From a paper:
Breakdown is then initiated with the conversion of the C‐3 hydroxyl group to a ketone (cholest‐4‐en‐3‐one, cholestenone) by the oxidase ChoD, and further oxidation at the C‐26 “tail” region via a three‐step process involving oxidation to the hydroxyl, aldehyde, and carboxylic acid species. These sidechain‐modifying reactions are catalysed by the cytochromes P450 [name] and CYP142A1 ([name] and [name] hereafter). Comparison of the effect of complementing a [name] knockout in the CDC1551 strain of Mtb (which does not express the [name] protein), with [name] or [name] reveals that the two enzymes are functionally redundant with respect to growth on cholesterol. Here we present a series of compounds based on an ethyl 5‐(pyridin‐4‐yl)‐1H‐indole‐2‐carboxylate pharmacophore which bind strongly to both Mtb cholesterol oxidases [name] and [name].
Residue numbers in the entry: 18 to 428
């Protein structure tokens, strides 16, 4: 029996996510077709012209694909499952220059070098300054009495995390943040005028200039670790550092932001959990917020050979799209997946991807950012209450909130 879905339904359709998360549709696939061919009409495949893709809705299947990276490739078609329908193939293939869209051994080399900037010591070194700025952001917002939670609470701390990691001077953080915000969302009418191509080029240019500068005058910031050769002589070229910075500007910006915004949305929806959070401040809340928020709705892979997955024959060359938003609510893995529970432990969500070679290198930096900001929100506006409904982002792979009006004072 075929799943009860509208004819021609596309789970990557940005017009859906601009309005809602298709929670009932995902649940229908998990019940009636956990692996399901999502057909795509000509010129409607978001930049891919192969007829469609396999929708992956179960967490165990998401994990299996992510582990078998020898079969399921990031490089072949990139991992983003939706661009503008008119994008040129060359604009998809330029993304193979960032680590996210590489396969081994190229990915293995880069990941080893970049891992020197995400050690627990390097990330933990950002704790104090990020805590300081989290407290300042919440106090500034609470003083305004009411406003846009997305812009006054959620936006700044993730960007300051990227800036602190890279050792960007305060005078430059303004344009760095601008370039980051110009990277994503070009399919929402509100951001129709942004040029991610142009920003990418400016970001790389800024980063290359920074790499050259930082070789002359090293410090402890991870940038020196990245461009300093090891015993094997392995290090990031200047253009490699540039493509890494472009990746950070995207990877750690709107992801953590939307986790913050949708975490607070859940707290407003579940006051018992908010009261529990304010009293205990449990750091397990961060993982439940990421599971609930699932900022990356979906990433794709391409099969390099025929592969049988959960009784379904995946053919060489076909795309599989891992819907993290479906897997993070998989009934077989979670007890009461649709209960927001900040104490859930263990919490094997795939908000940071499935375990494997590409697992989010910034997961713990993200968890620290989330924990610090919600401690500050609890410290400074414990009775904030929504004013109106959130405005969702028109995107086929990013689950974003553009605006959300809140009374930080309550009355
Ligand atoms: C709530 C926040 C975040 C979420 C939901 C998230 C999600 C993800 C996902 C789904 C992937 C792909 C994993 C896979 O394909 O198996 C990924 C990879 C990555 N993330 Fe994050 N991320 C977050 C925060 C961050 C931050 C703060 C940083 C850095 C400052 C970061 C840096 C990266 C990088 C560099 C990769 C590429 C790793 C690779 O391809 O080997 N992420 N992330
Ligand atoms: C400085 C290094 O980066 C670039 O030049 C650059 C960044 C970029 C981003 C997108 C894009 C794609 C999708 N959604 C947002 C942005 C597209 C093209 C991009 N290009 C150049 C493209 C050509 C590829 C090879 N032939 C000459 C140039
Ligand atoms: C060529 C320079 O690099 C890029 O253009 C680039 C880097 C990058 C990193 C992530 C990511 C996200 C989350 N966790 C890790 C990495 C996602 C997308 C990325 N893009 C493409 C931007 C496009 C903007 C328009 N809509 C389609 C996507
Ligand atoms: Cl986007």
């Amino acid at each position: 029996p075929s799943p009860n879905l509208p004819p021609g339904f596309d789970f990557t359709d940005p017009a859906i996510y601009a309005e809602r998360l298709p929670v009932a549709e995902f649940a229908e696939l998990r019940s009636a077709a956990p692996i399901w061919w999502n057909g795509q009409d000509p010129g409607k495949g978001g930049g891919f012209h192969d007829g469609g893709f396999w929708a992956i809705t179960k967490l165990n299947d998401v994990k299996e694909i992510s582990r078998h990276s020898d079969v399921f490739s990031s490089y072949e078609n990139g991992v983003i499952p939706r661009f503008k329908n008119d994008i040129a193939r060359e604009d998809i293939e330029v993304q193979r220059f960032v680590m996210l869209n590489m396969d081994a051994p190229h990915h293995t080399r880069l990941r080893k070098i970049i891992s020197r900037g995400f050690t627990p010591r390097a990330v933990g070194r950002l704790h104090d300054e990020l805590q300081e700025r989290a407290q300042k952001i919440a106090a500034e917002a609470a003083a305004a009495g009411s406003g846009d939670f997305v812009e006054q609470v959620s936006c700044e701390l993730p960007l300051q995390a990227i800036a602190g990691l890279l050792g960007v001077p305060q005078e430059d953080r303004g344009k760095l943040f601008h370039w980051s915000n110009e990277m994503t969302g070009n399919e929402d009418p509100e951001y129709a005028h942004i040029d991610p191509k142009a920003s990418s080029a400016e970001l790389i240019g800024y980063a290359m200039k920074m790499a050259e500068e930082k070789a002359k005058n090293p410090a402890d910031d991870i940038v020196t670790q990245l461009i300093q050769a090891d015993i094997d002589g392995e290090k990031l070229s200047d253009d490699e550092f540039g493509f890494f910075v472009v990746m950070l500007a995207v990877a750690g910006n709107e992801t953590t932001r939307n986790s913050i915004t949708q975490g607070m949305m859940a707290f407003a929806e579940h006051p018992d959990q908010w009261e529990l959070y304010k009293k205990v401040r449990p750091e397990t809340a961060a993982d439940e917020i990421v599971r609930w928020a699932t900022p990356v709705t979906a990433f794709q892979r391409t099969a390099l050979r025929d592969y049988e997955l959960s009784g379904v024959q995946i053919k060489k060359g076909q795309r599989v799209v891992m819907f993290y938003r479906s897997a993070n609510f998989d009934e077989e893995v979670f007890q009461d997946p649709f209960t927001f529970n900040i104490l859930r432990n263990p919490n094997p969500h795939v908000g940071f991807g499935g375990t494997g070679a590409h697992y989010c290198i910034g997961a713990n930096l993200a968890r620290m950012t989330i924990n610090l900001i919600f401690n500050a929100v609890a410290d400074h506006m414990p009775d904030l209450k929504p004013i109106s409904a959130p405005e969702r982002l028109r995107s086929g792979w990013l689950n974003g909130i553009k605006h959300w009006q809140v009374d930080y004072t309550g009355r």
